[PDB]
């Protein structure tokens, strides 16, 4: 509806060419009924040419992703810290579009690959489009934009055979990580549950770089952007993520689409850490360094407003595929910093859209257009959609009365560089020595996780590094891990049959910071949209009655309920053939269905039991409803007294207990820990 | 209208980026006042990226041209001969756009090169866009589309050095013409005054190919399209065209622009010759052969309606440069024929727009859009400007209720191939023997010109062939010319110092046809827009008074008057420095200015007399107004008794006589003839 | 030819497709002798598709031009002023390609329009391609690259009707000149005989900007490039130029082509004015200001070597139309200055080749290739002609033994920024007041012409 002016309705009418001539498109024109096709068949050629040219280049990174429309609402008048118009009044609303993504995979790769995730937000402001092009991880692998192709070549598939897809689990990636120690912090985040989020809705977004807020008086402060999820944080477990990559490559885009259509559109508090210019080097690291966080203990979050996604696209290609974000899409009241990663990005995003669009007029695509007037002397180029009336498109002119007028700090609400910014020194291709500590913050992050989270991170590294063929690369990796934590290096080395190097305690410490643990972020604040699989049977009418009564009680609380049975019928959503534990956040067996848990042509041997066992092993709340639990729980080897295992006769009591389980989300006592 | 919706007004406001952010664009952002430019200067890069990408590939042919908007009005309900909707009612109006062009020159080449000229007309009909992509000459050089690159490579500049621009006067072109005798008919037209028309408004347009008109009952007739100029026919002389190419490379586009702005928008009667399907081979040649005309004596013209151009474009690049014509843009009621030149064109024009536009969505540019709804399953591609609501874009479907519906002869006013068409025989790459007479019609054309026109054509061939370096090519040329006319070959040979081959009378005859002669087409039906230069002086108050009284009386009759003098002042439009005889259709000297016709720092020596003499030598009406007369005519060696030479004291009597001269347009008795 | 390995010979043999299948190309395949053309006629479609796509975008400026190959020969070992390898020995020869042009006209406009002219030279050095992208007039219209589209829009045809072609003789151009007084110096040069040279061979070339020569020890000097014509200087007269624009739009390209074929290949002494860094503001104007010349009386020319053009192209499109010059094509021993016109050009020329070539691999076109090995981790892109053996194209790596190695001042003959260059002050979009005298040098130029 924000792009309603560009919509084309095909719910009625006769087929036409692109120039409005009514045609057919089902049979080629031929010289006789069993004859050759004619070149004069323009109906054929226009249709096939279009098809032949449908594809455009995938994004060079973040190729796999999905988007939605929404609204940003300001919680206050923020004039006292920024001139930005979209933040200048309590309750002020601005349309947004957001795209979420992975980084490394090509555009049909699985959502649930282990990776960094993008979170890109466009504010269609009344003073121009403003984009925050962020990730779900607050720090980046590298300290200089010029290194980006080195990073990306190393993590993408090996270029002789293009193996492996959407994965860091190969020699080249771990070679790069071990030789470029800046990578350690982002690596630790990606090897945590932050690399396999439960959904786009259950992850945060970060600007990563320090930016500036600039007031109308010219004064500036340093900021970091934080989008805090109102759905809570949650992750998958790796073994789950692997199966889900096969059973549902579209899991995250489906989850987002469904949440929006059910009226559960996801929300984030859009926040900033704000510090003075004088604190650039006050926190024991450089705020120009994008491998570093500011701990919340040193600078608290200020909540600026609400981001809500509540409308799905009409056409994916036209909206999601074509949206072209840029950190260069900046508005008055915001400015850059001398972060050498940010500085280079400003070049890349303007240039890459030429590749994607094939032409320079990509800002004229509906999804990229602003919602205010455009007044400039840009002309021509392939795909030019405007018809410009001003026939004197040069400045300075008298023949168009000196219009358009120049905008700056003092006239026309122009963008302006923060006027206190300076530069001083030699022109150098040198790294600031203030960037040289690559290991303390990785250690801060590791220290801040729970014991089971630390085990999962260790396990993710053991998984990936065990697939590295080069013994030299594996040694080099242990050398770098060892500088973060001797314990990590020892535990990782045990899996790959190497000795860890001797402890090097230069960067070891015991500091912790709040807000980076997933397990530690307590029960989820809402269980709406979570998925409950009810395993039933058509062989017992009482099993379907149990299923229907459970459905009513669970749906009342906004859970998405799937009843599973051997075959479809009224009340049954899915067959055992298509069902999997990866499709549910909790699994309930109705006790009328106990007999399935001891063969059928309608689903693979042991499928009903496998769903239950997989769900248990992956830490999910599981239960049996009806009061006869022993047969199912014994077949599964699930103890009745287990945490997150439910056994009740009463449907009401069953659901009350089970819903607490869904909020807990994962029962971490079911995972073994290294001594 | 898609044009009005995309018009952009920059007559007020502050400069913005393409995403609506107010900016400046006059100074680069630098590290200090004498420092280097910063990469983070997004204002710089967006502006320069746009400039860097302004150009698109020129058209492969017809790159040099100009366009205007107007209206077509039907004179009648033509249902009795065609189903075409734009012809289905008396007074029915359809918007048009027309582009006129040369063929061989690049953008930037001179309008007044000797060449075939394009005349491409788009009708934005209520049943889709219909294009007639025609030339100002009714026959084409070649008989099969597959030869087009051979023709075009031969006429375009030699590919080692890219010489010469916009000219057939070089060895490769005449090699091709002499080896491919199909070229003779079009060659004769191009070597006549049809190769150097006075304006786009003073030339006719032709579809060239035989097409079909198809009725709603399925019956068909064969047609040729003829656009007959209501301004009359007129040419330049070669020596004038050469000078004009240097003095004003924009002469034809200026003439069109100016006529439209003064409310003298040019008009054509849109006509057809209509013959029965059974007459395809009845006239002594094949109607599938595009090297042949139907003589008016064999099939008279039917006037279908009025084409008027009356509005200039707003932005040349957006409208004229981007307009993308196709013979494949056809409507119900029209069909193709098996002309092997037409057949191949249908492929070329769909394909080449991919080159020009850089992507498949070229029909979405405003100038290319239709004026009725588009309903089809074409999707995606670079530059996709629509948001399609139908999410089941396939046929057959139930999930969008079977829409869009198929259109055909019986439903939806679908296009349909003429149902009487058949094909029979071997699949062959062979030329029909009915196409083999390459010489009789060239001779018919030559016979139909006046003696002086025949001399001009011989003179154009003497000029071009004299510049061919190869003696063998020159001999081969005489061989082919000789098959058309022994006299032509004798007269051409005299200039290049070869002997003509012996007469070969196989194709010789004395038949003539009406309507192909320019000299023969009688006085112009209107003199509005024609240019009168009045040569005066600032020395003499009486010269300027003579000039002003002449101006008033000439401007009354719609003539564009320029008073020329040594310097500008009130009443004087142009200096002798910038004035040339090529800028006028008639030249008047006022008596008071006699002294200039016997040196000055304000213009080149002899410029005033040169303008007068050049005008006389090129056949234009010339005179002296004031009744001294003898001194100026003696200085010029212009005889007072000469046809188109005027000498009067009375301004009223002078103008009455002079205006008849302008209608006569050219005085051909001033050109020498071969014995 | 220097480009002999890429040449295709068609002086014998049978017509083939682009994939070597022998074919014909004179008649379409039809359903009967008077029948419609068949879609299965691949001979037709491959031929016509190629034709349909022959054209590329003309250059945004300098679209009308012509080129030739030649040789540059150094007169000495210039190590005392520059590390540049092509200048490091007496008699050292380097292949060149040069393109000359007008500025404003489209690619079939007249050579003898009144205009500034381009003079672009590529040296295919043994340390990489070095381009000097110069003009025949030593000063430019504007003082900041960001103004270039304003200048060019004003001088190009009015955008409602695209009139007039290749001429400053219209309201918009003179509006710009009169409102932007920086333009006065170049305007006076264009309005002199330098706007209508007799030939490309009878004009000089200038780098325009101050550049730096950098020695292997890191010290730098400021230079201006001057290519002095050994044929002399000569102009047309305007009335002559106008007539010639119609009688022979190809006059300058024909003149060059003919001179080369007759064994009269044109020559230039390649010269520099060399001054110390301390003289940037010593001559009464700023050397960062591209609207200013250094009078020969203040800094004399040093002759570095001979440029001779002596071989015409084989294929105009492939060589002349496709050559893609960049001031960013720099070699060790040369460096930029903070001239805000030069600074912006560095961005433009890399970007615009994407428009012309339609793809990122434009340096692989034969005319653009270097004459020395390429070792880098650039990969893929449309039109990729190389087959790279190194399957670890990232730095730092161990799996390709740390190759390619980094090159810099101290290893691998790397390019390096002149190490004494600094910046200091506010980040500003402000013009230096040292650039404000727009009128004295125009007057110096006018004073220096003869009465006629
Ligand atoms: C020097 C190059 C470079 C560097 C250092 C980065 N990126 Fe980037 N990024 C690109 C070059 C790039 C790109 C090649 O320009 C992409 C590809 C597609 C596009 O429009 O831009 C891109 C895409 C891209 C997307 C996808 C936007 C969308 O959904 O369409 C996200 C979310 C980011 N990037 C985020 C980041 C973050 C958070 C970074 C570091 C803090 C980062 N990028 C550094
Ligand atoms: C098989 C190729 C071929 C053949 C045989 C022809 N043409 Fe064509 N023509 C082209 C291939 C083409 C082209 C390459 O497709 C052009 C260049 C730009 C475009 O839109 O199509 C074109 C452009 C073009 C234009 C310019 C349209 C404009 O103003 O934009 C006109 C007026 C014609 N042609 C007319 C003719 C006529 C009357 C022909 C024979 C009767 C003819 N052409 C044969
Ligand atoms: C910021 C933009 C800009 C600015 C300030 C300039 N130019 Fe430029 N120039 C271009 C943008 C450009 C371009 C758009 O990037 C072109 C078009 C084609 C190409 O390869 O580069 C170009 C082409 C071009 C050519 C044609 C090279 C060839 O023959 O292919 C010459 C000789 C010059 N320029 C010379 C200059 C000189 C002597 C300048 C000032 C001292 C100058 N340009 C400033
Ligand atoms: Ca690998
Ligand atoms: Ca976790
Ligand atoms: Ca392209
Ligand atoms: Ca030739
Ligand atoms: Ca049909
Ligand atoms: Ca103008
Ligand atoms: Ca002179």
Residue numbers in the entry:
A (entry chain D), B (entry chain A): 21 to 618, 622 to 698
C (entry chain C): 21 to 472
Relevant lines from the article:
Catalases (hydrogen-peroxide:hydrogen-peroxide oxido­reductases; EC 1.11.1.6) are redox enzymes that are responsible for the dismutation of hydrogen peroxide into water and molecular oxygen. The heme is deeply buried inside the protein, with a complex network of channels providing access to the exterior. We have previously shown that in addition to catalase activity, the catalase from S. thermophilum (CATPO) possesses a promiscuous phenolic oxidase activity in the absence of hydrogen peroxide.
We therefore generated a series of site-directed mutants around the putative 3TR/catechol binding pocket to further test this hypothesis. The residues Pro158, His246, Gln293, Ile313, Ile314, Glu316, Leu321 and Val536 surround the 3TR binding pocket and are structurally homologous to the residues that bind NADPH in the mammalian catalases. Specifically, the variants P158W, H246W, Q293W, I313F, I314F, E316F, E316H, L321A, V536A and V536W were constructed. A similar picture is seen for His246, which lies directly below and perpendicular to the 3TR ring in the CATPO–3TR complex.
